[PDB]
C-alpha cells in the first residue's frame, strides 16, 4: 500500500520545492476552475477561464512512479463545464473524461505518472481551442527517480497566444475571437496570461553568480515559441522537455502544447528579458518577460 | 550485380514488413501517379493528384546501402507531368529530373540509399507547391544496416495542409487556391489526405500492452506540426527523423518536408487521438486521428 | 595580457578562415551601420538597414574564451541610432546598451565569448522588430577551444522574412509594412537579403567529393525555417546551433533568432537548391539558394 501525501503546488513564477523522497507515493492534488475578468494590458480586460484563479494554473511537482489523485472542482459561478487533460497521464484523454465537471460540481480521479518530464495540462471541454485560448493550462513536473540537479533559482513560465475581437490595445472587456483563433492570428502573445505578468514590478529576481532553471511551457493554442533570453545563453536545454540535453543554445523551440527546460548561470548583474524570438510577438504583442539580476559588475565578461 | 528484390509497399496506416537481411539489394519499386476526385470532408470534394490512388503515397521500406530501382508510371488519364523527389536520394532533385513523366509514360531510374532515416518523397513538377498541395507525397523508410527493434504495431501517418478556394465546409468540388497557399492559410489540415481518414471507422487499432511505433511525415506544403497523441507520451522520438533519440516527449516538431519517429507502449485500453497541437488545426481543420485500443482496464494507471 | 588581433570578417556566402590558435586573444572587430536602398527582386527596391553595406552583416569567427572588442560606427547618413545585440555575448542586451550609436558617432565595447556556438547578432533599437526586418543581423561563430573538424567548403547563409507595403512583385521602392510584420505575413522570404542572392550567377560552388558545412542563421523577424537542401541529406546537424549533433536529417528547424550547422558530402555533380521547406516560401517568396557541384557522374549513386 502506497503512502498518501498532500501535494505542494505553486502559483506562477514560483516552482514547488524539489522532491526529497526515494519511494512511490499517492499525491493528492486539489484543482478548481474559475472564470474571472482580469487585466490583459493597460485598460484592457479579458474574461479568463482559469485553473485556480490565474494563468497558468498552479505548478504540480511529483516523482516518477507516483500516483496522482486529483479532486477536481468547477466553481458554481462558471458558465460552462471544465476538465483537465494531463500530458503526463497515460489513458483516455489524459484524464479529460474522468474530470468532466459541470459548474458547482466536483470530480475525483487518479493516474500514475509513469514517465519523468515537464508536462502541459489543459482543459479539453468542447470547443477545445476556446477553453485553451481562454487560459486553461499549466504544468506538472514529473521528476526522475534520482531527482534533478540542485539549482539556485527556479521559475515557472508558460507562453500562450490570445485572440481578442478588437485589435491589441482596444480598451474595455475584449471578447474571445473564434475567427482569429482558427486563422492563428493572435492579438496578444504573453508569458503567464497577461502583458507584463513577469515584467517591471513583477520581474523575476536572481543574484549574480546564481544558477537558474526555467521550466518553460507553451499552452498555445497555436503558436510555437522560439524561446530566448536576451543577454544570456542556455548552458543546458532539455530538448522539447524530454531527457535529451543540448548545450550552448541561444534560442529553443517550445512546441504548441509542449515544453522545454533551460538552465543558465547569471554571472553578471543586469536585466535579462525573456522573449519569443519570433520578435514581433515580443515587442508588439506582449511576449516579454524580465529577470533582474542584482550583483557586482565584471568588465571581463562585458 | 546485387540480389533483386520486389519491394512491398503499403497504402496508408499500414507499414511494410520489417527488413530482416544483412546484405545490400536492388529493390524494385513501382509507383503510379493518378489524378482523382475524392471526398475531403462531408459534402466536400477535391481533385487530388496522388501517388498510387490516395494520400499519402505507398510507404516504401528499404535498407541502408540498397539500390532503389523505381519504375515511375504516370497514368494515361493524368493532365500534367509528374515526378518524384526522394529526400532519401542523393543527387539531382532527389530523382525529380530522372523521373519527369508525361501522362501515359513510364520512367525508370535508380539511386543508392546512402543513409538510414525516414524520408519524405514528393512530386517536384512546377509549380512545386501546387503538386505537393494537391497530395503528392509519401514516405520511404531507410532502415539502418543493423535494422530496427521489433515492435508490435506500426503506423504510417502523414500530415498535410490543404488550400481550398471556398472556406472549410463549403460544399462541392473545391479548387486549389494558390493565394491561400502562398499566404500559408489552409482551410484543411489533415492526416492522410482527408478529414477522418484515420478516425471513426478508419481509426487505427491495437491491443492493450502492445508496443507502438508511428512513422510520422509532414508533407506540408507549409505547416509545421506540434505532433502529439492525447493520452499518451512518447517513450522515444527519433528527432526530426534522424539518428538522435529523445525520450519522454509529450509533443514533437515535425518539420515541413520532414518527419519524426515516435514509439510508445499502449498499456491501457481506450481511444487515443493523434493531433497537431497547434490545437485549432486539430479540432477545427481536421488534424485529428484515432488509435482505438482494446483490452482490460488497469485502474492503477488511471 | 591578451594578444591583439584584427579580425577577418566576411561578407556573405563566405566564411572567415578556421581559427588555428590554442590560446585566447583580443579580437578587434569593426562594424558600421548604413541605411541604403538596394534591389530585392527584379524591378523591386527596398530600403535596407545594414551592418557593413549588405544583408546579412559580416560573419565573425572567434575562439571560445576570446575577448571580442567592437568598434561600432553609425554612418552620418543614417536616420536613426543603431546598436548590436550579440547572442554570443553574456550581459545587458548582449551589448545593445554599450553600442547604442547615434548617426555620425562611434562606440566601443568588449565582451568575452564564454561559450562555443553559432550565434545570431542583430540591431536592438526600438522598434526592434523593424530594425531586424530591414536587414540588421548576422552571425558570429564561436569555435570550441579545440576547434572544429576540417571541411572542404564552408558557407554563410542567413534566412530572413521581409514585409513590403506592396505585394511580392510590385515594382519600385517598397516601404517596410508594420501591419504585415505584426501579422507575420511576409511578402519576401530570402537567403542573404535578396531574391537570388545565392542563385543563378550567384550560386555557391563546390566539387564532387568535397565535404560541405553551412552555418545557417535565421534572423527572422518572425518565421521559422524548415531548412533543406534538395538532392542532399544532412550527415550532421548541430541541433539549433548547439553542441548536440543529430545525423541523417532531411530537414531541420532553424528557430527565429536562431541557427543550425549542417554538414554533408556532395558525392555527385549537379545543382542542389537550399530552401525553407515550408515550400511556398521557397518557390513563391524567394527562399531559394543554389549550390552547383561540378565533377563526374556516378550512376551507382543515382
Ligand atoms: O536578443 N533578443 O532580441
Ligand atoms: O492532449 N491533447 O489535446
Ligand atoms: O526536396 N525539395 O522540395
Ligand atoms: Cu474549460
Ligand atoms: Cu493536449
Ligand atoms: Cu505532380
Ligand atoms: Cu522536398
Ligand atoms: Cu538598427
Ligand atoms: Cu535577439
CA distance A121 to A52: 13
Under 8 Å between Cβ of B99 and B109: yes
* Edge-first strand listing for the sheet containing C270-276: C204-207, C288-294, C270-276, C225-229, C252-254
- Residue C119's DSSP bridge partners are C140
Which contiguous run of DSSP H or E holds residue B282? helix B280-284
CA distance A251 to A264: 13
* Residue span of the structural domain in which C38 resides: 1-144
**B294: burial class by Cβ within 10 Å (0-12, 13-18, 19+)?**
exposed
Under 8 Å between Cβ of B63 and B113: yes
Contacts for B250 with CB less than 8 Å, ≥ 6 apart: A87, A88, A117, A119, A120, A240, A241, A257, A258, A259, B228, B233, B234
CB interface of B with C, residues 1-30, below 8 Å: none
Q: Which of C234, C248, C269, C291 to mutate to test the interface with B (most CBs of B within 10 A)?
A: C248
**Which residues approach ligand 3 with their CB closer than 6 A?**
B 85, 87, 94; C 228, 230, 275
Q: What angle do CA B252, B255, B260 make, to 5 degrees?
A: 50
Beta strands in C165-284 (DSSP E): 172-174, 188-191, 204-207, 211-218, 225-229, 236-238, 245-246, 252-254, 258-265, 270-276
Under 8 Å between Cβ of A84 and A31: yes
Please indicate if any CB of chain A lies within 8 Å of the CB of B239.
yes
Q: Which three cell numbers stand for residue C186?
A: 511576409
- The torsion angles phi and psi of B284, rounded to 5 degrees, stand at -130, -25
Query: Would you give the DSSP letter of residue B274?
Result: E
The Cα-based distances of C227 to A248, B255, C253, C262, C282 in angstroms read 20, 9, 6, 10, 10
* Cβ neighbour number for residue A175 with a 10 Å cutoff: 12
CA–chain centroid gap for C244, Å, is 20
CA distance A157 to A164: 22
Task: Pick the closest to residue A221 from A188, A194, A269 (CA basis).
Answer: A188
Query: Would you give the DSSP letter of residue B19?
Result: P
Under 8 Å between Cβ of A217 and A86: no
CA distance A174 to A167: 9
Task: Pick the closest to residue A121 from A52, A199, A175 (CA basis).
Answer: A52
CA distance C75 to C61: 24
CA distance A65 to A24: 6
Secondary structure class of C14 (helix, strand, coil): coil
Residue B96 CA: nearest ligand 3 atom is 1
Q: Are residues C64 and C166 in the same domain?
A: no
Q: Residue A11: left if φ>0, alpha if ψ -120 to 50, beta else—which one?
A: beta
- Residue A263's DSSP bridge partners are A213, A236
CA distance B280 to A132: 10
Alpha helices in chain C (DSSP H): 128-133, 178-183, 280-284
Under 8 Å between Cβ of A286 and A190: yes
Q: Are residues B298 and B171 in the same domain?
A: yes
A131 appears as a binding residue in the annotation: yes
- Residue B174's DSSP bridge partners are B46
Q: Find the residue in B nearest to A116 (Cα).
A: B248
Q: Residue A188: left if φ>0, alpha if ψ -120 to 50, beta else—which one?
A: beta
Q: Are residues C44 and C177 in the same domain?
A: no
CA distance B225 to B275: 9
Grid-cell match 527493434, residue found: B149
- Residue A29's DSSP bridge partners are A70
- Domain boundary among the residues C112, C144, C176 is at C144
Q: Are residues B97 and B200 in the same domain?
A: no
Q: Which three cell numbers stand for residue B185?
A: 492559410
- Domain boundary among the residues A144, A161, A185 is at A144
Q: Which three cell numbers stand for residue A110?
A: 487518479
Is there a contact between A256 and B280 if contact means CB atoms under 8 Å apart? no
Q: Are residues A70 and A162 in the same domain?
A: no
Minimum-distance CB partner of C256 among A235, A267, A277: A277
Q: Are residues A158 and A33 in the same domain?
A: no
Residues of B in contact with C250 (CB under 8 A): 87-88, 117, 119-120, 240-241, 257-259
Please indicate if any CB of chain A lies within 8 Å of the CB of B274.
no
Contacts for A144 with CB less than 8 Å, ≥ 6 apart: A64, A116
| Omega of the bond leading into A197 within 30 degrees of 0 (cis) | no
Residues of A in contact with B234 (CB under 8 A): 242
Secondary structure class of C241 (helix, strand, coil): helix
Under 8 Å between Cβ of A122 and A139: no
Q: Which three cell numbers stand for residue C215?
A: 552555418
Q: Which three cell numbers stand for residue A160?
A: 500562450
Task: Pick the closest to residue B276 from A181, A255, A30, A79 (CA basis).
Answer: A255
- Residue C140's DSSP bridge partners are C60, C119
CA distance B99 to B102: 10
Q: Are residues B137 and B264 in the same domain?
A: no
Grid-cell match 490516395, residue found: B54
Contacts for A87 with CB less than 8 Å, ≥ 6 apart: A94, A119, A120, A121, A257, B228, B233, B250, B251
Q: What angle do CA A252, A258, A263 make, to 5 degrees?
A: 45
Q: Are residues A154 and A298 in the same domain?
A: yes
Contacts for C241 with CB less than 8 Å, ≥ 6 apart: A248, A249, A250, C117, C118, C119, C258, C259, C260, C261
Q: Are residues A119 and A212 in the same domain?
A: no
CA distance B192 to B182: 22
> For chain C, what percentages of helix, strand and coil (3-state, to nearest 5) are there?
10, 45, 45
Contacts for A146 with CB less than 8 Å, ≥ 6 apart: none
CA distance B301 to C83: 55
Question: How many A from CA of B59 to the centre of ligand 7?
Answer: 16
> For chain B, what percentages of helix, strand and coil (3-state, to nearest 5) are there?
10, 45, 45
- The torsion angles phi and psi of B10, rounded to 5 degrees, stand at -120, 145
CA distance B157 to B289: 9
Sign, CA torsion B272/B276/B279/B283:
negative
Contacts for B201 with CB less than 8 Å, ≥ 6 apart: none
Task: Pick the closest to residue B160 from B130, B131, B190 (CA basis).
Answer: B190
* Cβ neighbour number for residue B100 with a 10 Å cutoff: 18
Q: How many domains does chain B have?
A: 2
CA distance A97 to A75: 18
Q: Are residues A97 and A33 in the same domain?
A: yes
Atom 2 of ligand 2, nearest CA residue: B230
Minimal CA separation from A167 to chain B, in Å: 20
Grid-cell match 556566402, residue found: C13
**Binding-site residue ranges of B for Cu cation:** 82, 87, 122-123, 131, 136, 277
Please indicate if any CB of chain A lies within 8 Å of the CB of B248.
yes
CA–chain centroid gap for B235, Å, is 21
Q: Which three cell numbers stand for residue C171?
A: 515594382
Contacts for C257 with CB less than 8 Å, ≥ 6 apart: A226, A228, A250, A251, A277, A278, A279, C87, C120, C122, C218, C219, C220
| SS3 readout for chain A | CCCEEECCCECCCCCCCCCCCCCCCEEEEEEEEEEEEEEEECCEEEEEEEECCECCCCEEEEECCCEEEEEEEECCCCCCCECCEECCCCCHHHHHHHHCECCCEEEEEEEECCCCEEEEEECCCCCHHHHHHCCCEEEEEEECCCCCCCCCEEEEEEEEEECECCCCCCCEEECECHHHHHHCCCCEEEECCCCCCCCHHHCEEEECCEEEEEEEEEEECCCCEEEEEECCCECEEEHHHCCCEECCECEEEECCCEEEEEEEEECCCEEEEEEECCCHHHHHCCCEEEEEEECCCCCCCC
CATH of residue B276: 2.60.40.420
Q: Are residues A76 and A214 in the same domain?
A: no
Minimal CA separation from B114 to chain C, in Å: 8
Under 8 Å between Cβ of C247 and B243: yes
- Around ion ligand 6, residues with a beta carbon closer than 5 Å are B 82, 123, 125, 131, 136
Question: How many A from CA of C79 to the centre of ligand 8?
Answer: 10
Under 8 Å between Cβ of C162 and C133: yes
Secondary structure class of B291 (helix, strand, coil): strand
Burial C254-264 (b: 16+ CB within 10 A, else e): bbbbbbbbbbb
Contacts for B100 with CB less than 8 Å, ≥ 6 apart: B81, B83, B107, B125
- The torsion angles phi and psi of B32, rounded to 5 degrees, stand at -130, 140
Q: Are residues A183 and A132 in the same domain?
A: no
| Omega of the bond leading into C221 within 30 degrees of 0 (cis) | yes
Q: Which three cell numbers stand for residue C161?
A: 522574412
Task: Pick the closest to residue B142 from B10, B18, B299 (CA basis).
Answer: B18
Under 8 Å between Cβ of A120 and A88: no
Grid-cell match 546484405, residue found: B23
- Domain boundary among the residues B92, B119, B144 is at B144
Amino acid at each position: 500500500e502506497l503512502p498518501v501525501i498532500d501535494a505542494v503546488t505553486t502559483h506562477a513564477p514560483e516552482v514547488p520545492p524539489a522532491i526529497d523522497r526515494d519511494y512511490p507515493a499517492k499525491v493528492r492534488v486539489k484543482m478548481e476552475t474559475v472564470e474571472k475578468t482580469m487585466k490583459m494590458d493597460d485598460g484592457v480586460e479579458y474574461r479568463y477561464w482559469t485553473f485556480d484563479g490565474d494563468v497558468p494554473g498552479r505548478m504540480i511537482r511529483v516523482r516518477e512512479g507516483d500516483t496522482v489523485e486529483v479532486e477536481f472542482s468547477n466553481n458554481p459561478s462558471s458558465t460552462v463545464p471544465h476538465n483537465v487533460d494531463f500530458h503526463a497521464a497515460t489513458g483516455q484523454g489524459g484524464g479529460a473524461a474522468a474530470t468532466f465537471t459541470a459548474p458547482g460540481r466536483t470530480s475525483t480521479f487518479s493516474f500514475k505518472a509513469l514517465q519523468p518530464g515537464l508536462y502541459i495540462y489543459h482543459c479539453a471541454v468542447a470547443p477545445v481551442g476556446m477553453h485553451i485560448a481562454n487560459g486553461m493550462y499549466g504544468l506538472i513536473l514529473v521528476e526522475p527517480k534520482e531527482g534533478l540537479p540542485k539549482v539556485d533559482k527556479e521559475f515557472y513560465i508558460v507562453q500562450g497566444d490570445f485572440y481578442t475581437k478588437g485589435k491589441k490595445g482596444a480598451q474595455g472587456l475584449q471578447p474571445f475571437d473564434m475567427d482569429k483563433a482558427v486563422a492563428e492570428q493572435p492579438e496578444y502573445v504573453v508569458f503567464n496570461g497577461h502583458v507584463g505578468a513577469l515584467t517591471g514590478d513583477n520581474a523575476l529576481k536572481a543574484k549574480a553568480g546564481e544558477t537558474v532553471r526555467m521550466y518553460v511551457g507553451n499552452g498555445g493554442p497555436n503558436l510555437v515559441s522560439s524561446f530566448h533570453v536576451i543577454g544570456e545563453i542556455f548552458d543546458k536545454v532539455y530538448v522539447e522537455g524530454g531527457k535529451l540535453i543540448n548545450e550552448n543554445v541561444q534560442s529553443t523551440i517550445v512546441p504548441a502544447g509542449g515544453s522545454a527546460i533551460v538552465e543558465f548561470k547569471v554571472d553578471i548583474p543586469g536585466n535579462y528579458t525573456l522573449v519569443d524570438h519570433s520578435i514581433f510577438r515580443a515587442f508588439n504583442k506582449g511576449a516579454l518577460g524580465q529577470l533582474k539580476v542584482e550583483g557586482a559588475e565584471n568588465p571581463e565578461i562585458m
